[PDB]
């Protein structure tokens, strides 16, 4: 078990690097702190370029590029080796809640904001290529696996899937009762994990050939409290386990097959915003509003 | 199962089934409302 203090404020997001050897953490302090996973878990960055809260972190699939969506209306792209802010996408009129970069090349990025716009990008160009206008605020976006689709969840409860080729809404999924704070797509690309404020975590069949009712599995046991934070969700790399942020200070991991809890680990003092799995070894980190990151082995 | 109820500062990561499963046996009648609640200090639990 390892404890990683040193954020002055709430930790909203944390991600392992795809090679497993290094870790990124960021939150309300606006700084992005890069940690070694092994050894003394020492720090060796301060990334300083933002002016507002860092809402989400994502690496690209090779790990050279770190993407940070911020409430400052900008998306920063960092070089992981040098720590230089490579680019500033500044196209959004309101807070940027989320981002996610494409699995396959080229280096596309998509974004969701409280202005109700879902904007696609290309890192080569300074402007948005395409904007889908949602009627209400968007809290989390991810691509699909094929990099052709944006999936967005918002405060309008429904899950909306766009197609970049037709520029049109293509299918919608209904069942969640409240704001979709978090979306995450499995490494195989078949399934999506969703967290919503209705105290349910669900798995949906994202594949083209799903049944008409796409909700395959329902998980329970997390809590959303009065702080209404954007509690995120993540998959294990093998797809056997799922984790969800919960505001009741307990760190939840479910077995996807048996639908049981497997770990419900105490020790945080605040709302847990994101939980992430290490890619190779069974190490789990959980980021909480108590200004601490907890890292520990599971079996 | 394998985890004591009189425990603090657990050094490893216990499984759900090995930490949240019931304490067995009957309750005693010799404990009032204040005595049975999981208090840390005289009137209650402060965290």
């Amino acid at each position: 078990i390892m404890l990683l203090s040193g954020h002055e404020g709430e930790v909203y997001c944390c991600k392992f690097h795809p090679n497993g050897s290094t870790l990124a953490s960021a939150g309300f302090d606006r700084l992005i702190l890069l940690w070694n996973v092994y050894g003394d878990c020492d720090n060796y960055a301060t990334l300083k370029g933002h002016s507002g809260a860092v809402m989400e972190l994502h690496y690209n699939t090779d790990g050279s590029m770190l993407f940070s969506a911020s409430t400052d209306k900008t998306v920063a792209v960092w070089d992981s080796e040098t720590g230089e802010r490579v680019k500033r996408l500044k196209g959004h009129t309101s807070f940027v809640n989320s981002c996610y970069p494409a699995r396959r090349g080229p280096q596309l990025v998509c974004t969701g904001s409280d202005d109700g716009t879902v904007k696609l990008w290309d890192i080569r160009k300074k402007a948005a290529i395409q904007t889908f206008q949602n009627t209400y605020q968007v809290l989390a976006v991810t691509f699909n696996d094929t990099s052709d689709q944006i999936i967005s969840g918002g405060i309008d409860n429904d899950i909306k899937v766009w197609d970049l080729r037709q520029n049109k809404l293509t299918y919608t999924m209904r069942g969640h009762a409240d704001s979709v704070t978090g979306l995450s797509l499995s490494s195989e690309g078949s399934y999506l994990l969703s967290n919503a404020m209705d105290n349910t975590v669900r798995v949906w069949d994202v594949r083209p050939f799903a049944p008409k009712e796409r909700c395959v599995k329902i998980f329970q046991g997390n809590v959303h409290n009065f702080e209404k934070n954007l509690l995120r969700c993540s998959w294990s790399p093998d797809g056997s386990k799922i984790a969800a942020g919960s505001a009741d200070r307990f760190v939840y991991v479910w077995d996807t097959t048996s639908r049981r809890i497997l770990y419900k680990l105490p020790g945080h003092a605040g709302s847990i915003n994101e939980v992430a799995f290490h890619p190779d070894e069974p190490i789990i980190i959980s980021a909480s509003s108590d200004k601490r990151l907890y890292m520990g082995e599971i079996q | 199962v394998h985890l004591d109820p009189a425990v603090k500062e657990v050094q490893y990561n216990p499984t759900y089934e090995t930490m949240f499963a019931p304490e067995f046996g009957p309750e005693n009648p010799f404990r009032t409302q204040q005595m049975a609640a999981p208090r840390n200090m005289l009137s209650g639990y402060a965290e």
Binding site: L3, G6, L31, Y44, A45, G83, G267 | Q11, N40
Partner: peptide
């Protein structure tokens, strides 16, 4: 590159709360 920051890692236990 970007400077080494204030963070330190250390070994810790968790400690379950009562209840």
């Amino acid at each position: 590159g970007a400077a080494g920051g204030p963070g330190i890692g250390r070994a810790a236990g968790r400690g379950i709360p009562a209840g």
